[model samples]
Target: PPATPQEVQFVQHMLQHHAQALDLAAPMLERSQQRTVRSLALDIQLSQREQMRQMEAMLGRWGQPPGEPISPEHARMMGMASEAEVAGLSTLPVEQAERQFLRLMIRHHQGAVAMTLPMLDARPEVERLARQIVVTQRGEIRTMEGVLGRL
Candidate 1:
């Protein structure tokens, strides 16, 4: 059966939200001086990219390319960085930047996990992807913590 209008919108909204996270992490993956930090960023980018593709595929199946721009409510749910926070991330020393990045990203991933929880009972495919997200991101969070402690 086709998804209800709400389901379509939900998937589309979440996809864009994931895209912003990937954008925030991409520069760190490419430009960070710390290899472990860079590797963590790469992991985030790659996993989120796959999740974006999954959402896009859902949109395709629903006969939509994507959906509208994010709502203000959805933006709040995403835990988006302030302009100052983003700028600070861009300019800090490698170690400090990595620490800040990990902290911000941990918060971001937590938000994602929260958002996906309700869907687990209602949407199977969505739940599956969310489960993947929880497992991978939790592991990354642990790895990042180790990196933070070492530095």
Candidate 2:
């Protein structure tokens, strides 16, 4: 069957989602006080870079070209941070940054988890990628929750 518009939008939406995640973790790499959270953010930042490349190629295969530009408005993603949140993440004290970053990222990943599941019947490559995200992000969610609660 030919791909539906909804299916293509999934890739478009997720590309923005993944890119925002990089911004979400960027401040933490330099400013977080908690070694654990900072490290987690580093892992996320790195992982997103590779995952984003994969998504771009997937878009090309679908006859799209990067689809849409990333914007800080966060559009309508259910898990994106607010403009204020992104600002504060960059300017907040290290302790506060960790707490906010933890909370924001956990939910952001949860957003990714939700985004992938809905399109599980799309392309095989997309489906396989979705499964990987469900597994990886859920594990990270657990880790973020643990750290957030402990703080």
Candidate 3:
């Protein structure tokens, strides 16, 4: 089936959405001391990257160009960390960075889950992916919370 405009927008925006998550977790992968934190950060990178490829491919299937990078204002609306916040975490030590990473990531995942809610009438594949996103991100949110409380 052909893609709808809504499907295009969702896939594009989600590309940008997943992009920020990659940035959020990048520094934590090396700086975090907690094994769980490190693993979670790595998982975000791996999973989000894989999802991004699916998004990119979806756009290609529709003969659409990939989405643009989101502006800072849009990023804020999406619950993405500001560049300054990413920079702060980049230099922060393991003790502080892990906590901040988990906190920010949980919020980011919540934003992603919210994005999936309005996608009820897209293609079946898109719908399924949206549902999967809600499940996966919510699951990660809980995991993040559990780890956040412990540290």
Candidate 4:
């Protein structure tokens, strides 16, 4: 069955969301020295990259094109980081960077969960993806909170 317009829009928005997360994680691979932080960064990079591919595949299967540009206002509504926030992450010292990464990423994940919540009643495939996103990201948020608490 073809996806509903809502499902297509959700997937499209999330593809951009995941791509931004990968952008955040990519720098941590080289900048963060803490073993745990690096490990988490690697996990984020890999997982989100795969998720992007999955979303792209879904778009292709649905006969939709990839790379539809979202407005800056819409991107902010989707919980993306600002250019300043991303730049700050790149320049902080390792210790500060680790803490900031945790803080920023937790917020980012929360945003993703928020976006997915309304989609829970969407079509089967979109619902499955939405539920998985909510579960996975909430779990990660918990993990990050724990780490942030300890830091």
Candidate 5:
């Protein structure tokens, strides 16, 4: 079945969002000292990358391009990190970086959950994916919060 325009837009925008998350997580593998931080980072990297691939494949099936480059305003609306935030995360020391990453990621996942809420009634596939995003990311958000609380 063809994707609705709303679904296409959501998938495309989310792909960009997930890409930024992967970028944030990539450095943690090498820079983070805490085993929990590194493990969570790896989990985020692998999970979001797989979801991005699925979104891309859905776009291909629907015969749509990845759509426009995400605007800074739009990115923020989607809970994505800003350029400066990503840059700052890269420069922080390991301890500070781990704490910052968890904090930022908690916000990021919350944004994703918010974004997916309205799509819960979309087409079956979109609805399924949206629910998955909500459930999975909410769990991640809680996990990050626990990490943050311990920090």
Candidate 6:
């Protein structure tokens, strides 16, 4: 089925969101020496790859590519990590690194929830994907919390 215009836009924005996340995760997956970190990185990369494909499919159906620019509001709302945050993650010890990762990611996922909030009622297909994002991310947050609790 052809997506409503709003659904197409929402998917486009999300695809962009996933692209950045994949970029951030790729190095960790390939270079991290820690088994748990590498495994978590792989999980993030794989999960987002599947979602990227799904978003692309939706874009194809909409006669578009995953090409729309992210809104400034989208940029601001997602609590997307700053360059400093990325740098901090790179140099920190494992325990602190994981803490930083979880905190930033929790914020990132919350941003995702914000992006989808307006679309949920207007676009069912987009809403479905958004719901999945929420569920998946909440699970990650729980996992991170467990790690924090143990440390």
lDDT (Cα atoms) of all candidates against the true structure = 0.73, 0.81, 0.83, 0.82, 0.84, 0.70
Query: What TM-score fits each model?
Result: 0.84, 0.88, 0.93, 0.92, 0.94, 0.79
Better of 3 and 6 by lDDT: 3
Q: Candidate 2: deviation at residue 15, Å?
A: 0.8
After TM-score superposition, the amount by which residue 86's alpha carbon in candidate 6 deviates from its true location, in angstroms, is 2.6
Better of 1 and 6 by lDDT: 1
Counting clashing residue pairs in each candidate, in order, gives 0, 0, 0, 0, 0, 0
Q: What is the C-alpha RMSD of each candidate to the true structure, in Å?
A: 2.2, 2.1, 1.4, 1.4, 1.2, 2.6
- Residue 132 displacement in candidate 4 (angstroms): 1.1
TM-score of model number 2: 0.88
Write candidate 6's Cα lDDT for 1-151 as tens digits.
6677777777877787777666556556545676776677677778778888878887886788765576666565666666677666677775676667767766776777677777757456677888787677677667756655664
RMSD of 5: 1.2
Greater lDDT among 1 and 2 belongs to 2
Q: What is the lDDT, from 0 to 100, of the residue 145 in candidate 6?
A: 69
Prediction 3 TM-score vs. true: 0.93
| Regions more than 4 Å wrong, model 1 | 71-74
From the highest TM-score down, the ranking of the candidates is 5, 3, 4, 2, 1, 6
Highest TM-score scorer = 5
1-151 in candidate 4: lDDT tens per residue? Answer: 7888878888988998888888788778878877888888888778778778889889998998765877877777777777777877789877887887888888888889998999986678778878878888888889889888877
Cα lDDT tens digits for candidate 1, 77-140: 6775555666667788766777778777777777777766666664677668767767776777
lDDT for model 2 comes to 0.81
Q: Tens digit of lDDT per residue, candidate 2, span 74-142?
A: 554668888888888888887888899988888888888888888776767878888887887898888
Over 4 Å off, model 4 = none
Error of 6 at 56 (Å): 0.6
Q: What would you estimate as the lDDT of candidate 5?
A: 0.84
Candidate 5 lDDT, 1-151, residue by residue in tens: 6787889999988878778888789778878778888888999888888888888888888889987998898888778888887776789877887887887788788888888899986788788888888888988888889888887
